[PDB]
Amino acid sequence: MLTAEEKAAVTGFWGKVKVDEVGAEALGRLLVVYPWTQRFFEHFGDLSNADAVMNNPKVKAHGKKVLDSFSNGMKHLDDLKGTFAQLSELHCDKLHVDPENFRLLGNVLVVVLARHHGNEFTPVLQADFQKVVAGVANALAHKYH
């Protein structure tokens, strides 16, 4: 739900994004900058500081997994709720993650793209990504809006 020209710039950019390390970085950064989200992942072992978190193989693995579904919804921009409906139910009904956190992961995602892509992360381009992250965030919030 993003004017054609907007899907174009976003999807086009997205091919240049190494999903594996953006994923890992994204998720580690979330757990460091927002220390309470750690509660959800304490099964990943040692998260006592940002070296243990950033190097923890299991955070690294989950990073790819998260951005893989992200990078999948990127192919269905007209139907976010559709795709993420299932993952909504996990996060909302089994995991009990508060929706404000989906928005926090989007924002950190944005920051990482910035870090990897320099002045190519143009202001106009970010605006589009901000629309991509709120969309995913709603999709995910779905299973109780």
The residues binding a copy of itself (CB under 8 A) are 134-135, 138, 145
Whole-Å CA distances, 80 to 12, 61, 72: 18, 24, 10
117 is in an annotated binding site: no
CA atoms 50, 65, 87, 136: torsion sign:
positive
Q: Is 83 in the site for ligand HEM (CB under 6 A)?
A: no
Quick one: what does residue 135 bind among ligand HEM, a copy of itself, other proteins, none, with the CB cut-off 5 to 8 Å set by partner type? a copy of itself
- Collapsing DSSP states into helix, strand and coil, what is residue 122? coil
Sole binder of other proteins in the list 3, 15, 36, 43 (CB under 8 A): 36
13 interacts with other proteins by CB under 8 A? no
Hey, CA dihedral for 74, 132, 118, 67, is it positive or negative? negative
Q: At residue 91, what are phi and psi to the nearest 5 degrees? A: -65, -40
Q: Which residues in this chain contact other proteins in the complex, by CB under 8 A?
A: 25, 28-29, 32-33, 35-36, 38-39, 50, 53-54, 96-98, 100-101, 107, 110-112, 114-116, 118-119, 121, 123-124, 126-127, 130, 144
Annotated binding site for heme b: 62, 91
